[PDB]
């Protein structure tokens, strides 16, 4: 039959779709969601075989044990125990695109268990096999002989194996193709593996039983009252006697309890469904679900005789709360939701596509502890358990059908293809009925990148009409078709319109106000985190809180795709696309997360916590005004810090209680201070700290925060003439000059500053020269590839503008005494096939005091790309255990990713100064320096600066950070002016103008002291 | 042109057409109408079938069509006559003047139906006059209707021709038979025999 | 695998749907809807034999036919013919309500036709079968080699023969079946055929 070669067969013998179910024979069992006898797992060590291609694998393997299997761990991928290579591609499908047809070297995944099954589960009631997640389609025997057979990689496909079991020793066998026709729909950018890599576990349910169950809320126009209403239908023999009880709980305390005997209203001229039942609970003062407090009730559904015999119990947790559009506007309860959210894949360095509850864990609590109050599951519905966290920590969920055919040409060629509608729609469906009692779920989604075609506007109207009550959206085709609710675009710049033929990209804020448009916007995905990113996030939140009608978005995303290799040492390593072998591939591209693999996070972290607080602030005068973007919530666990401080010293500080309504404001008054000691700019810091811990942070965690420059006293004060003169001593190759025991040496031919020695020690070990370029950032490289240049990217304008080969060529350099000092005037010109690129003119002036002040003037030509900084470096001879400075800080930042960076004194250990991306470039500057200290040197000016033991030569040449050594010494770059990163999106420049070094003329001074 | 799909003997009527296992099913039936004859002028009303209740899987379908050729409206009658899947009030045999208010899918006067709260649409019967024996009694009370109000456009009588069969005597002569005449039990009698004429054609 | 007992499964290898065609090899034909010489009737006198259900036909039927198969006219309705009754049952739908299965006795009705292909529509090109009606759903065989399986009594299922036939005189066999899951779907007010 070649099922998996076929669309019309997504399965065989498979049971119904429907909500999570435990089948409890006790009701308080259901009530707590203790563990239940009747759900049992059979997860654990299973035997497992590899074979090239269905057509490999031996007979003889449905009866019996192969000796040449091995024993492995299930749930698992099985190219994460190395049987074969995973593949990174990102649109391109990793099989010939030949629908429906599949490659005939498809690799198989041969599993067994043998396992008991007790006679009690035999003797009566219907015992079922679930596998909640096969990759991508399989055949199952038991005992030898044929269940069943499913498609749909990520939603549970279900089995009765009640004629089919023996008290006793059972076996089961499951055939897992890699390839079929479901891996159309299943083009998703991330790896592509393979396996039975979520839970298998064993349902028992009584013949007369509960088959699905939908819960519903609906309210009084102020959310006083709510109706709860419980829909139940069951399987089995009708009889008079059973009943159906639906109680709702509040902790301990019932709230509310109906009971009736099944029988429907009528429906239409043939009656109503005499096997379900509407039971309806009236609730007063409704405590209400929300991201912000997560009230939840349970509800538990009683099937039992009319005696009170209970044949069995199922439950779900339950919000109360309503999700709408009105007036072009998102609201949750009746407020306008604010997304400040995040796509997550589901992904683990060691194990794959395996998730586990800690991981899961992991990651909620970063969000929360992030500002983000929202997920998409891009692009598929998730392991069970990921709704059961979020409807219980609180996060809005977007739950996505697995449908993505990116790789055709065009997107849509299957999706406006009715004979692709029936697997279309089991994706959707079979998610819906699934996951539709969770209250975290706001917004179903039809998938992703499979363009629009007529099937989308079917299933749009399947879920309107099955339920309406959430909003239904879905990009493709432009991110406003007739399939979404919700204008809802990737990577849609704020204010710059990118008019793509067919599906342009508006600027947000233009395409709210199109012609006729009238719905709310929010991105599916946006801001790209790939590599040292997220310039100009803080553009969109600007624009989100002034546009009512901009709610947010899902930024694009959470957590690296990199995976673990080893080395010849045994130690470990981070692997991207190309690293298995697997060709072709997209090499880095799986690797956009605000976080790293194993959690620890990137800087662009920070940025989107501060972006995305919940508390705003203004100042004017003594006064603070805080307003709070809570919608639900009084600010009660909330204190206000506050420091002045100059110039890094602190002066001043307290604290306030807040007391802040839901979008209320609160004015605090700080107190008169006394005026400052000294010259300098103050700095008025302030902090928002939550004194209590929460289920998701810690007491102390500080969740919001605002500088503000109060008060500057410029220093008049002439500084108090030096004890000595230094002296110049003038050669034919060099221009030295001698002060106690430090000398400077400029060398006449190249005219730059080649060595200065302490004592009769060398600091230097490479001059100290300007530098115009940066090791490549991801975002500046874009999709260009030596084998395909991309000549609109940055890298390839400065390469091609010989920015990287251009080498200074002398126009002066002259030496001066003068009262009391040296000054040293030097010319250069940087110069590629006959054309000035930069010149760049500076003095050195070396005074009595043993201070080095440097001025720089540069010209840029206006011709050439502007450049990637324009600053000085040199090679430290000596390496040194910290690094101190007064500027922005503690982690790294860039002029358009610098908001959440504090001006303050901070001190980190060396390494702390280097950004271990994987795959390396430009990284670690700190911006608004104003005084750096390393060693006994010190600089003082206003610069950006990083340091490191990595040269930009080793970083650019290196594309995995494990391959980085040490050079001898420190690298040093000081920048007067360093150019954004973007990152709108990291396949099309996305510096902003306003970040680009266009000046045509920079100037930037510099003093170098020793401390 | 109406999709082959009908699932009158359910209980609840929409029992198969609200049930999402059987979209695919019910999807062929109506894609493979559409792809065979949407270049046809004489087609210029799609139907999703007939009495099948109103399931959530006809307004998946409705949708489809609308989105694929929107040069036709698309009518279905199921579950009440005016559900979201019909541009066209369509019912089968309300009356003129006469409601029959019965539960869930009342059958209203056509002339009270185009008006109640908030409805626009056109309304044309997709069954009306049952011509069953010595029938048509009332005839002229629905043209009367139809031509005083813009809004009834209309509509199919029910039906063209009697669905009866030709069996043949001991002596070898031909005679119309129905239901139940051929041995088939449980049947439904003459009610095959609805039409304006004679299965030869000769009119009623 | 009984697929008349499935309702995932409508067809087998069945061709895409589109509007009438006819291959006309000279515009001003199809300009005047003229005969096309590359759309052939079948029609005509087929050879049939009735089985109460599925498992009653014998193998041998496939590569030959049965010699107690009678000769008939298709297109046409068995029960027309005497093989079985019609039925007439309005709303009550004439087999027991228990989706998707249907009776085990299920009338099949087992045709075949041996009829001749030209080398030239083999040299090149495409030929394919086109049932524009079979009630209520089948098995096609060509050569005795399975070719696929339909259901949908009222529009055309089309199957692509290129690969089974051969110059000279060739042998299809149907089975058609009487019930099928798609007669759930086919429970209009007339008769049962
Ligand atoms: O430059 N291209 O040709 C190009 C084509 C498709 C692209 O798709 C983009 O890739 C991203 C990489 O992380 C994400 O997968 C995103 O969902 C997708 O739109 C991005 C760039
Ligand atoms: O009286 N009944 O119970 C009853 C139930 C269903 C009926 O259905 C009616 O039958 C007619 C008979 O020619 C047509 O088939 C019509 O489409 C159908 O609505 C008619 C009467
Ligand atoms: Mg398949
Ligand atoms: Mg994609
Ligand atoms: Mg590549
Ligand atoms: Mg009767
Ligand atoms: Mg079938
Ligand atoms: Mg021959
Ligand atoms: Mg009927
Ligand atoms: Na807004
Ligand atoms: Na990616
Ligand atoms: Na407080
Ligand atoms: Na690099
Ligand atoms: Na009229
Ligand atoms: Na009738």
Redesign the interface.
Known sequence: ?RDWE?P?????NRL?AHPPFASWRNSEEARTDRPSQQLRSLNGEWRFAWFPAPEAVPESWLECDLPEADTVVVPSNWQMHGYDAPIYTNVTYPITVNPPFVPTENPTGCYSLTFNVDESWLQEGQTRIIFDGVNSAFHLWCNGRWVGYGQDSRLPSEFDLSAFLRAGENRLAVMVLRWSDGSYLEDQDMWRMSGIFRDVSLLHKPTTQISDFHVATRFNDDFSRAVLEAEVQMCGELRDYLRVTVSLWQGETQVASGTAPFGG??????????DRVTLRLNVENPKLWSAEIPNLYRAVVELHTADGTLIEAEACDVGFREVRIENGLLLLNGKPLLIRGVNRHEHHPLHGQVMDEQTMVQDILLMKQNNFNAVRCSHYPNHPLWYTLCDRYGLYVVDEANIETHGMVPMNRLTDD??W??AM??RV??MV?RDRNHPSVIIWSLGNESGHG??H??????I???DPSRPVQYEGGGADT?ATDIICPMYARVDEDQPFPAVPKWSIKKWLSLPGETRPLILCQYAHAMGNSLGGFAKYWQAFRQYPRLQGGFVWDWVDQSLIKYDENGNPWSAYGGDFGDTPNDRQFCMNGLVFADRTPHPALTEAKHQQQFFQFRLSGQTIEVTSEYLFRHSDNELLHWMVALDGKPLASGEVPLDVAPQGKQLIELPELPQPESAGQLWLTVRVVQPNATAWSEAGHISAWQQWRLAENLSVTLPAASHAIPHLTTSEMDFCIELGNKRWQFNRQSGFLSQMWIGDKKQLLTPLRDQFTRAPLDNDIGVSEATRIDPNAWVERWKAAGHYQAEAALLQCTADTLADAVLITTAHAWQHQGKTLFISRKTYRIDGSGQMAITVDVEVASDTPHPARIGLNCQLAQVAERVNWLGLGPQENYPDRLTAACFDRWDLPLSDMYTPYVFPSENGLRCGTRELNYGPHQWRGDFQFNISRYSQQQLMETSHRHLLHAEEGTWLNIDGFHMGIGGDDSWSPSVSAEFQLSAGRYHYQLVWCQK
């Open positions: 039959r076929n019309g067969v997504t399965q065989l119904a209203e009528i429906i239409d001229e043939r009656g109503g469904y005499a009715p004979r509608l029936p729609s089991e469906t079979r009925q007529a099937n506007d079917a299933l749009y109207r399947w309107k009409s099955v007739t």
